[PDB]
Amino acid sequence: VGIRFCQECNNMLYPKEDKENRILLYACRNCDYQQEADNSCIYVNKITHEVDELTQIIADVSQDPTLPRTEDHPCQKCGHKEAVFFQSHSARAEDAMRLYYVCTAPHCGHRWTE
Amino acid sequence: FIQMSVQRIVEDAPPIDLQPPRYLLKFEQIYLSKPTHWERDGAPSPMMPNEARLRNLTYSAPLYVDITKTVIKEGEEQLQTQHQKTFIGKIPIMLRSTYCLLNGLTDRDLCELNECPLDPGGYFIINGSEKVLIAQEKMATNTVYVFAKKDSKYAYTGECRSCLENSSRPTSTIWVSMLARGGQGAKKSAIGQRIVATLPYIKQEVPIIIVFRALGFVSDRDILEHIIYDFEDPEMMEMVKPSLDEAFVIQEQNVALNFIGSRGAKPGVTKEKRIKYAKEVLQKEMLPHVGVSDFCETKKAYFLGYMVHRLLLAALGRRELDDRDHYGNKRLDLAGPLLAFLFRGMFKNLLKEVRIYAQKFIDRGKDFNLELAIKTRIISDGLKYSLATGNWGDQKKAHQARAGVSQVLNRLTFASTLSHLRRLNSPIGRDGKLAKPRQLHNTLWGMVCPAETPEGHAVGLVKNLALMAYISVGSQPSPILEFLEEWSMENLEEISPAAIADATKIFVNGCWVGIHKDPEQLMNTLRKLRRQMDIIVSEVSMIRDIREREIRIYTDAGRICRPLLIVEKQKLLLKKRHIDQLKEREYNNYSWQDLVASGVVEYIDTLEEETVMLAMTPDDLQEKEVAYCSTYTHCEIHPSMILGVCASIIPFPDHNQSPRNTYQSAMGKQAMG
Amino acid sequence: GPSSQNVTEYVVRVPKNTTKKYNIMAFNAADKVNFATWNQARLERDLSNKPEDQPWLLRVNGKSGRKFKGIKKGGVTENTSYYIFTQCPDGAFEAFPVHNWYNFTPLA
Amino acid sequence: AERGELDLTGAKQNTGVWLVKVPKYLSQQWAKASGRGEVGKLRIAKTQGRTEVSFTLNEDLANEHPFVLQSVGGQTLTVFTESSSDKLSLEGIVVQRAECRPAASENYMRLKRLQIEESSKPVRLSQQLDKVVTTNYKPVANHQYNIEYERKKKEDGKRARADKQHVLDMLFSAFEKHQYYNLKDLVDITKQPVVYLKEILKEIGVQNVKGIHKNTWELKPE
Ligand SMILES: [Zn+2]
Ligand SMILES: [Zn+2]
């Protein structure tokens, strides 16, 4: 799923097929450095696009003076009783009125939806 | 314009070395004298602004310069000589300025010259008439904007208009496109869209990997670290993969320069000229605001990478597109940045015709004399023409110029005079039916009057600015850069592109100038310096967006500001001690300036106004309760300062229907008094 | 150890003259070049530009044993001078000015 | 022994060098190096949990600078020399990089005075003149015209009206060295009138365009 760079000329390693041992070989097209593939899959295309933005929001958003705050929902990892919440603010806005939270305690940065 | 912007133009001009012997000429210092009128028999005398109106004169001041001339013939002696205070021309003078005859006079003397002590000033007197310059709007420069033309081949587009610090007549613009997905073809259906670029001074589109290699960086591990800042992202790397496939066969520097060098304003017949031609166009016309020297070409690579890294984020749907009419992307051209633009094209035109007079006169080998070379009618009649008639161009150029500037002052009633010296103008057409450049935008709060506008065909095209709105004048970014480097800011060259994922890119005036790893302490250190005015002047804006993880700083001229009240934890910073000593300015010498320099008010730009939380009134919004917010950062002075000049004479304007307030503001301008 | 328990003081001099100009020769760490493999080297200004501005051409272990091209940095003393500090037998330190910065890279 | 030959001794000795970044004002103090050119003394204190290096200015040079150690990783650095005898030498490899920084001795205003003192002359300003300076003088003969008049009086008189046959000695003389000469080259030899010179040129020769205008005369091939 990732990418492979050549170890000699630092370029993009293409996948190739050899008719001897039935194993995927990654080859270069400037030099001919070789090696075998460990996962033996090339292409993947996610159409659902249901990526949870809990992996994209940053912990320093709790320094924003223009975001609402809450005393109801406390943090689990530290027990702080003050959070700051917001919406998806991105694409995939068909049914996007969820409410992600971020703890505001210094050096906690814990994030969670509900 | 007349203390700095005119001295720099003659000082930063190429000498005219010319030739056997050869000669030198270079200009050093500029002087001016008070406006003067030459009588019929050649006896000068200072002209007062009143005679200029009665006798249909023109209110202008003569202009001098120091020129030094050295002859270089290696004739065992370098003979130099100088002619100081050489006459050049005459510049109009705006009334009540620091160079007028009415500067700093008292009412007993203003009445003695038959002048009104209430006259505001700020207009020219040209052939008896009274002309006023209208501030023109303009799209902001040196920033990246991402749009989406839903009619043409492109699925996304970026733009960056660049100009190297007030020194270029044109402004080179560069696009970074991306072709459409639904390209009907059984070939590219599989690979996908290819990122393209449309450089200036070339005919054909160019793939981006090619123009990357023309700067060096032929390897594809080094290119793909200027464009992608973290290699744990497979979704983005998949999108840049089909950009390499078409630039795969051309894999070295010199053949790349030939590829772009083959299609220019002149197709190269030989090879070395194309490799020469492609060298400077990619060096002096590509992103001149970053650096124009032939060195420091790693910076032109990073910025071109950031321009492309930002185009992909707009395709994965991770950041929203830019707004065209968002009033934080606009700049205003006052009389300063307008006369300076018109003075360049007439100083070059004055040097272009000292050569033509020197060569014709030095081939015969006689000698040289410069007092006869200077055609004085170039600058005098050049400015006076375009101001008097309006078309912002040249006399033989009455077809290529922008019209509508410099109209006649309105003197029907005293509030029709003030409402003329404070007026903007958006340069879009006067009959286009597109509503989005005409409707009222949220960002006009407090900086443009919402009610005052004319009807007819010019609805929403001309606008008047609010009462406390203040336009900035400009400064040099030198003293902030020297402070930033000593506050732990890593330069771009001496850093590894893997220490860039968790750092906040620091921009200054449009140019990427480093990174930083602890921004929140930098920010509230930059601010507490401006609050008390040690290193940074009060008209710079400093934006920080937490999410996109960067920091911007601006120092240029054209941004529009307005003062606000600074708020600490939940209380104002304006204590009573400031009031009982401010009601005594008459014999205490304590005024507005001593109020800014004490850190209780602050000018807030439009861009900076998106990272702020305002309260509208102290006694009512800053009380602890079950409250709306609790982190207020500023507070307004009085919410009645959001109205213009002609709309703030209406009693109880918050009780009328809205179109009614628009009619009167365009109707109190024609009331007799 | 002495890196934790070592204390010393040495004199520093900055001679107003030198018998040779001092430059920096920089290598990418990522290459991890074994200098021991450099039996010999040749070093000449690059010929593409057909002097002090000329990029260097380094030929190690023969004409094609090893070859690099060195490109001059934009600036070296634009804001702050760079000094070479060398230890002398008397323990005192000697400082040498850096004249230029050249960037050296490997060549297929 | 060759010009393009590089000494590898330093490298092969594994000679190490140190690299230190120094501010210009200090470096300007250093150009005034005391005595031979010693600028002071360096102090190095290493402990189990910390290491401190600093340099102190020569008392003479004066009339604490902590060091910030920098990484040299990612790029191998070596020092190479050019002697005053133009001999080339590699002194060593850089084993340390560092930066001299201020510490508890200044704030921004203090730093600023130094910047101002370095300007002395800033970018030029437009000054305000008093009244109006004289512009038009009363010269009688323009100076350029008088220089031309003198040259024309010193010339226009050496016309070699005689030498009816001797020129031809000098003209042929020149014509043997190059088959043809531009009328101007021939004039540079004969100061006599061009019309009369052309008659002398036409009498003993013919003018060819030679192909790029440039009136050029040559001896008849007969
Ligand atoms: Zn390879
Ligand atoms: Zn927490």
Structure tokens at B580: 């009982």
For chain D, say whether B362 makes contact (Cβ under 8 Å): no
**Do the bridges between strand B614-615 and strand B634-635 make them parallel or antiparallel, or are there none, so unpaired?**
parallel
Does residue B220 belong to the interface with chain A, where contact is any CB pair within 8 Å?
yes
- Residue B643, classified by CB atoms within 10 Å of its CB into exposed (0-12), middle (13-18) or buried (19+), is buried
Closest by CA position to D98, among listed D17, D15, D11: D17
> Are B458 and B430 spatial neighbours (Cβ–Cβ below 8 Å)?
yes
Q: Are B653 and B647 spatial neighbours (Cβ–Cβ below 8 Å)?
A: yes
Q: Which residues of chain D does C55 touch, with a Cβ-Cβ cutoff of 8 Å? A: none
Please check whether residue B452 is in contact with residue B663, taking contact to mean a CB–CB distance below 8 angstroms: no
- What's the start-to-end Cα distance of chain A, in Å? 31
Q: Of B609, B589, B585, nearest to B469 (Cα)?
A: B609
Q: In whole angstroms, how far apart are CA A56 and each of A110, A111, B490, D135?
A: 13, 11, 26, 72
Instruction: Enumerate the residues of chain D whose CB falls inside 8 A of the CB of residue C58.
Output: 6
Q: Alpha carbon B537 to chain centroid distance?
A: 18
Long-range contacts of B590-598 (CB under 8 A, 24+ apart): B596/B533, B596/B538, B597/B532, B597/B533, B598/B532
Task: Give the distance from CA A68 to its chain's centroid.
Answer: 26
Contacts of B95 by beta carbon, 8 Å cutoff, 6+ apart: B49, B59, B102, B119, B121, B122, B123, B124, B125
**Sign of the C-alpha dihedral computed for residues B481, B484, B486 and B491 taken in this order:** negative
D211 is in an annotated binding site: yes
Under 8 Å CB-to-CB from B32, ≥6 apart: which residues?
Answer: B2, B61, B62, B63, B64, B91, B99, D126, D128, D129
**Spatial contact of B542 and B522, defined as CB atoms under 8 Å apart:** no
Is C75's Cβ below 8 Å from some Cβ in B?
A: yes
Distance CA(B247)–CA(B227), nearest Å, equals 16
User: Residue D93: which of B213, C35, B227, B189 has the closest Cα?
Assistant: C35
Domain residue ranges in chain C: 1-108
Cβ of D109: how many Cβ atoms within 10 Å? 9
Task: Tell me how far apart the terminal alpha carbons of chain C are, to the nearest angstrom.
Answer: 45
- Asked if residue A83 lies in contact with residue A43, where contact means CB atoms within 8 angstroms, the answer is no
Distance A89 CA to ligand 2 centre (A): 22
Indicate yes or no: CB of B293 within 8 angstroms of CB of C75. Answer: no
Beta-bridge partner residues of C70: C56, C104
Instruction: Give the CB-side neighbour count of residue B282, counting CA atoms within 13 A.
Output: 27
Q: Which helix (H) or strand (E) segment is B69 a member of? A: strand B60-72
Coil, helix or strand at residue B436: coil
List the domain range (segments joined by +) for residue B160.
143-331
Q: Ligand 1 centre and the CA of C66: distance in Å? A: 19
Domain range A46-114, CATH class: mainly beta
Which residue, D95, D40, D93, D52, is CA-closest to D72?
Answer: D95
Distance of alpha carbon B407 from alpha carbon D177, whole angstroms: 75
How many contacts (CB atoms, under 8 Å) link C and D? 185
Dist. CA B290–CA B303, nearest whole Å: 8
Alpha carbons B659 and B401: distance in angstroms, whole number: 36
CB atoms < 10 A from the CB of A20, how many? 6
Q: Report how far apart, in Å, the C-alpha atoms of B303 and of each of B49, B289, B300 are.
A: 52, 11, 5
The fold adopted by the segment(s) D156-218 is: Arc Repressor Mutant, subunit A (1.10.10)
DSSP string, C5-72: H-EEEEEEE--S--SEEEEEEEEEGGG---GGG-S-EEEEE-STT--TTSPEEEEESSTTTEEEEEEE
Entry resolution (Å): 7.4
Whether residue B499 contacts residue B277, with contact meaning beta carbons closer than 8 Å, is answered with: no
Q: Quick one: how far is CA D129 from the chain centroid?
A: 37
Chain D segment 56-75 residues within 8 A of C by beta carbon are 73-75
Nearest to B18 by CA among B351, B355, B367, B350: B355
Chain B interface, mutation test: which of C48, C50, C73, most B Cβ atoms within 10 Å? C73
In B, residues 292-321, which contact A (CB 8 Å cutoff)? 317-318
CATH number at residue B309: 3.90.1110.10
- The two tokens of residue B309 are 């890294």
Q: In chain B, what residues touch A66 (CB-CB under 8 Å)?
A: 611-613, 631
Q: Which of B366, B369, B500, B525 to mutate to test the interface with D (most CBs of D within 10 A)?
A: B366
Helix B253-261 and helix B272-284, axial crossing angle in degrees, nearest 10? 80
CB pairs under 8 A between B and C: 7
- Residue among B395, B319, B332, B282 at smallest CA distance from B135: B332
Does C4 reach chain D within 8 Å, measured CB to CB? yes
Contact partners for chain C, using 3 or more CB pairs closer than 8 A, are: B, D
| Ligand 1 center from residue A6 Cα (angstroms) | 4
Residue with tokens 């709105």: B469
Cβ–Cβ of B7/D126 closer than 8 Å? yes
Domain with CATH 2.20.25.10 in chain A: 46-114
Which helix (H) or strand (E) element contains residue B157? strand B154-162
> Does B296 reach chain C within 8 Å, measured CB to CB?
yes
| Residue found under tokens 């009633």 | B413
**Three-class SS state of B380:** helix
